[PDB]
Design an enzyme around this catalytic site. Structure first.
Site, PDB file in Angstrom:
ATOM      1  CE  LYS A  92      -5.282   2.886   1.191  1.00 31.32           C
ATOM      2  NZ  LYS A  92      -4.702   4.092   1.326  1.00 31.32           N
ATOM      3  CG  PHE A 152       0.684  -6.289   4.974  1.00 32.13           C
ATOM      4  CD1 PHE A 152      -0.343  -5.674   5.883  1.00 32.13           C
ATOM      5  CD2 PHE A 152       0.057  -7.505   4.630  1.00 32.13           C
ATOM      6  CE1 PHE A 152      -1.654  -6.127   6.110  1.00 32.13           C
ATOM      7  CE2 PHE A 152      -1.359  -8.005   5.009  1.00 32.13           C
ATOM      8  CZ  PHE A 152      -2.104  -7.332   5.427  1.00 32.13           C
ATOM      9  CG  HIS A 210      -6.524  -0.896   0.605  1.00 35.18           C
ATOM     10  ND1 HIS A 210      -5.432  -0.419  -0.424  1.00 35.18           N
ATOM     11  CD2 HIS A 210      -5.687  -1.353   1.707  1.00 35.18           C
ATOM     12  CE1 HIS A 210      -4.291  -0.684   0.346  1.00 35.18           C
ATOM     13  NE2 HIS A 210      -4.437  -1.375   1.403  1.00 35.18           N
ATOM     14  CB  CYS A 259      -0.836   0.118   1.297  1.00 33.51           C
ATOM     15  SG  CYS A 259      -1.289  -1.655   1.756  1.00 33.51           S
ATOM     16  CG  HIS A 267      -2.683   3.548   5.212  1.00 29.20           C
ATOM     17  ND1 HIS A 267      -2.268   3.095   3.976  1.00 29.20           N
ATOM     18  CD2 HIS A 267      -2.701   2.338   5.830  1.00 29.20           C
ATOM     19  CE1 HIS A 267      -2.653   1.784   3.889  1.00 29.20           C
ATOM     20  NE2 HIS A 267      -2.552   1.320   4.963  1.00 29.20           N
ATOM     21  CD  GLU A 284      -3.313   6.899   8.467  1.00 30.49           C
ATOM     22  OE1 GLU A 284      -2.728   7.628   7.828  1.00 30.49           O
ATOM     23  OE2 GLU A 284      -4.093   6.210   8.323  1.00 30.49           O
TER      24      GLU A 284
END
Lengths: 401, 364
Positions: free
Chosen positions: A325, A389, A330, A164, A295, A306
């Site tokens: 998003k 990740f 996503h 991402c 994010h 976040e």
């Protein structure tokens, strides 16, 4: 140090294709949610994603045979075409330039991988697998096909596979590459395609929303898988000014951090470090940030972590913090690239795109998420966050030229 | 050493886990010996397009990495982790390299653990419901997982990147590190690339082969370098990275692309082709590989190609290729005073059209 500017945007997205369509979608709170067509959703109990609805590769792709690419590659190449179009750059101008092409991805042609396995499983025989598919599944190809299509041999074609965050990594690499003086131009972004792998992954994580994506909402239930491509043309200020290029925004800086904690869970300290690195690189104070493009995936963990990181860095009056998003879903490797473009467009057009599907702000996310409707603002400097990740965080800071 | 431009990256350490065995020493021994590595593939991998493989001998994930979080660990990650230990620790597990939050990590790959992703998808297709997968395998599936795992393992909070590119990926990684360090984003970098052997990889490679051609000899492993700024280097430099250049072979003339790429790399390094003391092509078992070999055989002194054994002895090591190439140069150079100050050139070509060349100056 050399200044770097965004002279072109290319966009293939669930809410619009091209800079115009995309600026519209963002201002509209368009949701890209629609039924999945790309693969068989039987058995998932669920069949919504944020696909690109009506992709016509022929509009964009001229040189590279379509079967040399899977969908993600096609999106990458189309957005790249659009971006160089949008920059006023032709293949003639590009062939001459040493350039970096850096495309982020999470899943690459994982759909092609699935289809390959389908062929083996149907036949009960590895030899049934299509060579054409097997030749195009490696992520490196997402970068190299752009060079192929735009007839640019003098390219470092690097696919960044930081999931991402990959779009922001890629833009940052373009920035570093131009700042180094070694190249004056970089085509940077990210691309991904909806696939069964990603759907099944997030499903199995319980991270798929059963309806809509509600970032920072108190009853957010997760994400929708998305896809698309965003390609940004980065150029030295020198090279842009000298060319008569329209400059959308300036790239001020970025920051990379690694959480070095958990393979999938976000990390507050890690995100905060990334933000601080980005501000330091940008040479920008917390005060001067007009909004954060979060994010903001819409999962329980992500949004509370976040938010916490943002509040750590900014104190208890952080800037408006919005989640693109909410609209795109996503879009994996494209996510931060499409966010970056949204940020640049937000700068250029003096708006802040909304966090849509917003009923009620989580009390643990004490942010103004610009709920449901775009607002006007004097947006001069924008932070675009991304976490992935493997604790990979990348934060990009754009500014008005 | 004293001759180097300011902020030239230097390699001050390396590690490898390779078909020669585990560790830099085994790699160095294998390279210097020009040893063969092909073995008959383990029965456990199930049917393969070829029985002959260049696996890492004696490599067991849990034996190497212990019982914690290793049961579901992909081999790619495992190889990277074992390599990271060789790089940062000494043989007794002492900390050989001081790392901090300004230590970067960049790993090149082809397409991550195809074993993980194909197992996941096989489960998706064949289990009760299509998201009834081995959930414990999911963390490991991420393409960036090996790089991220390395950071978890060694507490590396600095930049953490994974780049694809297959055989060129080690050089893309190297150039990436070089640039980021150039911009002050890291003072030190763990740079390298890795490829696991898997039945999935082997079958996909076989499928992708130009129809007719024999199933390739495939290898695996991971090579890693500790890179520092020459000024600030905290350990003696083994080699200076003078240039890394890349091209895309858009005209399907891999010879011409390799030639152009190498000439640019040599120009940018400020060296003449006649100065090349060791030249290490990737030896891809492809037309592009053959073209690469022909291109270099014309471009560099013939003696530069005989200096290091063919990378063919390791099989097609995929993403590991360029790192193994650089490591072979360092292995050839180490414990041989003749190598000091000499130029080395490493070149790779990838199916997906990329060409990359690096020019090193051997120090010691």
């Amino acid at each position: 140090r050399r200044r770097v500017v965004l002279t072109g945007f290319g966009v293939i997205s669930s809410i619009g294709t091209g800079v115009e369509e995309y600026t519209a979608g963002l201002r509209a709170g368009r949701s890209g949610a629609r039924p999945i067509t790309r693969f068989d959703t039987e058995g998932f109990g669920q069949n919504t994603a944020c696909e690109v609805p009506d992709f016509e590769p022929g509009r964009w792709i001229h040189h590279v045979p379509l079967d040399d690419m899977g969908r993600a590659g096609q999106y990458a190449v189309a957005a790249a075409r659009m971006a160089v179009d949008d920059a006023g750059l032709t293949e003639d101008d590009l062939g001459e330039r040493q350039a970096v092409i850096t495309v982020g991805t999470t899943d690459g042609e994982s759909h092609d991988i699935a289809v390959l396995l389908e062929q083996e499983l149907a036949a009960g025989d590895p030899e049934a697998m299509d060579p054409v598919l097997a030749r195009r599944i490696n992520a490196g190809r997402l970068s190299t096909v752009i060079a192929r299509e735009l007839r640019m041999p003098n390219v470092e074609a690097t696919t960044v596979t930081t999931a991402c965050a990959a779009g922001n990594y890629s833009v940052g690499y373009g920035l570093d590459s131009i700042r180094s003086g070694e190249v004056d131009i970089a085509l940077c972004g990210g691309a991904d395609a909806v696939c069964r792998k990603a759907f099944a992954l997030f499903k199995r994580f319980g991270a798929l929303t059963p309806d809509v994506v509600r970032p920072f909402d108190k009853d957010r239930q997760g994400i929708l898988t998305g896809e698309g491509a965003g390609i940004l043309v980065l150029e030295s200020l020198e090279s842009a000014l000298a060319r008569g290029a329209r400059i959308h925004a300036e790239v001020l800086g970025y920051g990379l951090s690694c959480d070095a904690a958990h393979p999938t869970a976000p990390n507050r300290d890690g995100i905060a470090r990334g933000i601080r690195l980005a501000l330091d690189d940008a040479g920008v104070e917390q005060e001067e940030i007009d909004f954060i493009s979060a994010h903001g995936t819409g999962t329980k963990a992500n949004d509370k972590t976040e938010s916490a990181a943002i509040v750590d860095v900014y104190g208890d009056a952080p800037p408006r913090t919005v989640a693109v998003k909410s609209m795109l879903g996503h879009s994996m490797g494209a996510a931060s690239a499409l966010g970056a473009i949204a940020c640049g467009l937000a700068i250029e057009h003096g708006f802040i795109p909304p966090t849509i599907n917003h009923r009620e702000t989580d009390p643990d996310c004490p942010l103004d998420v610009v709920p449901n409707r775009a607002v006007e603002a004097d947006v001069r400097i924008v932070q675009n966050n991304s976490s992935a990740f493997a604790g990979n965080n990348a934060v990009l800071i754009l500014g008005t030229y | 050493e004293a001759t180097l431009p300011p902020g030239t990256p230097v390699i001050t350490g390396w590690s490898a886990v390779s078909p020669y065995g585990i560790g830099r020493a085994e790699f160095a021994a294998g390279v210097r010996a020009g040893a063969k590595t092909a073995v008959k593939a383990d029965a456990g991998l199930g049917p393969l397009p070829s029985s002959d493989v260049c696996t890492v001998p004696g490599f067991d994930i849990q034996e190497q990495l212990g019982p914690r979080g290793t049961a579901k660990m992909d081999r790619l990650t495992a190889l990277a982790l074992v390599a990271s230990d060789g790089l940062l620790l000494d043989a007794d597990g002492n900390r050989a390299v001081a790392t901090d939050e300004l230590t970067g990590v960049v790993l090149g790959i082809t397409m991550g653990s195809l074993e993980n992703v194909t197992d996941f998808l096989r489960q998706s297709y064949t289990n009760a419901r299509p998201f009834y997968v081995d959930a414990g395998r999911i963390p490991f599936g991420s393409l960036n997982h090996a790089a991220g795992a390395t950071a978890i393992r060694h507490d590396l909070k600095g930049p953490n990147t994974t780049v694809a590119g297959g055989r060129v990926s080690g050089l893309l990684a190297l150039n990436y590190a070089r640039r980021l360090m150039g911009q002050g984003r890291a003072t030190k970098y763990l740079v390298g690339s890795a490829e696991e052997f898997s039945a999935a990889h082997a079958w996909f490679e076989h499928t992708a082969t130009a129809s007719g051609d024999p199933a390739p000899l495939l290898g695996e492993g991971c090579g890693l370098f500790l890179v520092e700024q020459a000024e600030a280097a905290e350990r003696p430099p083994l080699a200076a990275v003078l240039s890394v250049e890349t091209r895309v072979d858009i005209d399907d003339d891999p010879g011409a692309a390799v030639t152009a790429c190498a000439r640019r790399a040599l120009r940018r390094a400020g060296v003449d082709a006649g100065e090349v003391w060791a030249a290490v092509p990737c030896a891809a078992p492809t037309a592009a590989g053959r073209a690469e070999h022909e291109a270099l055989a014309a471009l560099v002194p013939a003696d530069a190609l005989s200096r290091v054994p063919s990378m063919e002895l390791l099989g097609d090591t995929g993403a590991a290729s360029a790192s193994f190439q650089i490591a072979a140069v360092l292995a050839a150079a180490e414990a041989d005073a003749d190598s000091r100050g000499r130029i080395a050139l490493v070149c790779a070509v990838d199916r997906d059209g990329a060409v990359a060349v690096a020019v090193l100056r051997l120090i010691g």
